[PDB]
Structures are given as C-alpha cells and as structure tokens.
Ligand binder design. Structure first.
Ligand SMILES: OC[C@H]1O[C@H](O[C@H]2O[C@H](CO)[C@@H](O)[C@H](O)[C@H]2O)[C@H](O)[C@@H](O)[C@@H]1O
Ligand SMILES: OC[C@H]1O[C@H](O[C@H]2O[C@H](CO)[C@@H](O)[C@H](O)[C@H]2O)[C@H](O)[C@@H](O)[C@@H]1O
Lengths: 167, 182
C-alpha cells in the first residue's frame, strides 16, 4: 500500500505526461489555425481601411457607440478623438507574440504625434505623447491595460460596423 | 398638366448628394468586405472546433485513467489545494480536516451548446456532513445543499463562485500534479 500508493503516483506522472503532450499539441494546432487565418484576412482589412477613410468620424462614432469604450471617454478625450482618422489592429504573425493597436490622428492642438501606438507583448509598450503647450490630460489607458486592448481587438475590430451603425 | 409638371419639377429638383452618398456607398462596400472577413472567421472557427474535438477525444481516456489513479492516493486533493496559492488561502484548518475525506474531484465542461461546467467533490464517510458528493455548476451557479451533522456546520461557503471555479477548472484540472509535487 505504501508501495502501491507509490506505484499509483508514478503511473499518475506518466498519464499526466501524455496529457501534457496532448495539451501542447492542441495549442499548437489551434495557434497554426489562427496564424493561417490572420494571413488570409489581411487583404480584406487593408481594403476595409481604405473604405473607412471615406466615412468621416467613423472611429469616434464606433467608440462612442460601444458601451465599454464610452465609459473610458471624457469630454476632452472625445474631442481629441475627433482627429482620429484610422485605427489598426495588427497581430504579430505568430499570434502568441501579441499585438499592436495604431491610432492615427490628423494635425491637432493636443499632441504632435501622427500615430499613437500601443503594443502588447507575451509587457506593454506605448508611444510617448508629445503634448502641446499645457494640454497634458482614454489617454491614461494609453500610458489593466489589456481589457480595453482586448475589447478593441476582439469586439470592435472584426466588425466595427456593428457599433458604427447601432446607437 | 402644366400645374402638375410644375409641382413635379419643384419636387424632383429642389427637394449632401456628395458627402451623404459617399458615406452610404462606403458603408455598403464595407459590408461586402465584412462578408469576406466573416466567412474567413467562420472557417477558422470551424477549424479550431475540429482540432478541439479531436484532442478532446484523445485526452479523455487519460483524464479518466488519472481520476481512477488519484482515488488510490490518500490526501491527493487537499495536498494539491493547500499547495495552490489561491485555493490555499480559502482553506481554514477546518476545511482542510474535511478535505482529507475528499477522494475525487471531477471537472466536466459542456461547452457544445453552452451549459458551462461542473465541479464534483466526492467525500468518504466523515464527521462533518452526510453528502457523498458536493457539486457546483457555473453557467449563474447551482450548488449542493450541504447536510451538516450536529453543530458540525462550518471554503464550504463556496456552496452557499467564478474566480475559484475558474482556478480549479483552468489552472489545476489540466495538471494537478504540478501542485501535488511542487
Ligand atoms: O479564430 C476564430 C475567431 O475568428 C475571429 O477572431 C479572429 O479574427 C479577428 C478579425 O476577424 C481578430 O480581431 C481576432 O483577434 C482573431 O482572434 C472572430 O472574431 C472570433 O469570434 C473567432 O472565434
Ligand atoms: O469529448 C469527450 C470530452 O472531451 C472534453 O473533455 C476531455 O478534455 C478536457 C480538456 O480538453 C478534460 O479536462 C476532460 O477531463 C476530458 O474528459 C470535453 O470537455 C467534454 O465535454 C467531452 O465530453
């Protein structure tokens, strides 16, 4: 029994080793699916970008019509957001590495930066905002950072029209 | 006819046609592109579901075997829990004494046509309650009514949710052995 309990635990160790290999294989095959479809989708996101450029205030309105993102938007934040021209989400090619969100802003009284970028690593890198005279204030989320990041990546990004078109 | 044509002319001319139209056209063209995106999302989804079904079937006999082996080791699950940083903190010295009678944990997920998951806790005969199995389901959660013995009423507040359930399901279930040892 003291030996039998010992036999059982070695046997548990071996079964768990098989479990672990199978958990690893499943994760790898899933990740490859995501890597595959991230590549196939890229020409359509590019095209979709060009079309959104023809709808002024597309990204502001999309954000405003999203219950979670709106909770993140103060008065001046939303005014700054009027210079918001384009949002891109790019997942790193291997997917596991993380992703980046780019926010393009037209020339504005708030900051010098053309693009404000937030990167997520699997760790969080963001653009330093070159605020203009006395403008230093959403933009705090900029500097948990991954909740709004996931909302944009996973909710808004696949179908932003779902929010644009629905007050 | 003259008066009718006058009304018609006024209506069609007098009664924007750059910016509005541009917008409306763009929206229709974005929808077209979305349809391509959605088909791709659906293909990926299907692919991931086929991968998940395959490895689920591969994994199952091993998790079955692992449970039967676990039942031969006294204290496996207390030791696993006491060694887990978040479950350990919820165990008083009492709940720990009770968990010595805990022979078996099962986590069963029903995802296909969502019904959440279930954790079943099997106990040998013990001084604290009558129940052979204490279960909890999370979809927001159903739980076994514990039939305490006589002033034995006591972690087991959990059966009166999300965080602990997720910990056991997501952390410990796939590999309890890393806590049992480490
Ligand atoms: O792989 C299955 C998922 O496909 C979509 O999500 C991926 O594609 C999106 C763009 O269409 C990305 O924003 C996202 O990060 C990717 O995970 C779909 O939105 C999901 O519901 C599917 O499960
Ligand atoms: O298809 C049989 C069952 O597969 C899944 O369950 C197995 O895989 C899980 C992790 O992938 C293990 O945690 C579980 O113990 C295995 O039995 C699925 O969760 C079940 O609903 C399926 O019946």
């Amino acid at each position: 029994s003291e030996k039998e309990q010992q036999e059982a635990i070695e046997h548990i160790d071996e079964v768990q080793n098989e479990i672990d290999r199978l958990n690893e294989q499943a994760s790898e095959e899933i990740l490859k699916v995501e890597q595959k479809y991230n590549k196939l989708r890229q020409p359509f996101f590019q095209k979709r970008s060009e079309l959104i450029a023809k709808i002024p205030n597309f990204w502001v309105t999309t954000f405003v019509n999203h219950p979670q993102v709106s909770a993140l938007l103060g008065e001046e934040d939303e005014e700054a957001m009027h210079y918001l021209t384009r949002v891109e989400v790019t997942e790193f090619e291997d997917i596991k590495s993380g992703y980046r969100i780019d926010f393009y802003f037209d020339e504005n009284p708030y900051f010098e930066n053309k693009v404000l970028s937030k990167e997520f690593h699997m760790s969080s890198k963001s653009t330093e905002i070159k605020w203009k005279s006395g403008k230093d204030m959403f933009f705090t989320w900029f500097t948990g950072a991954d909740e709004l990041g996931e909302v944009i990546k996973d909710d808004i990004w696949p179908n932003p029209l779902q929010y644009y078109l629905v007050p």
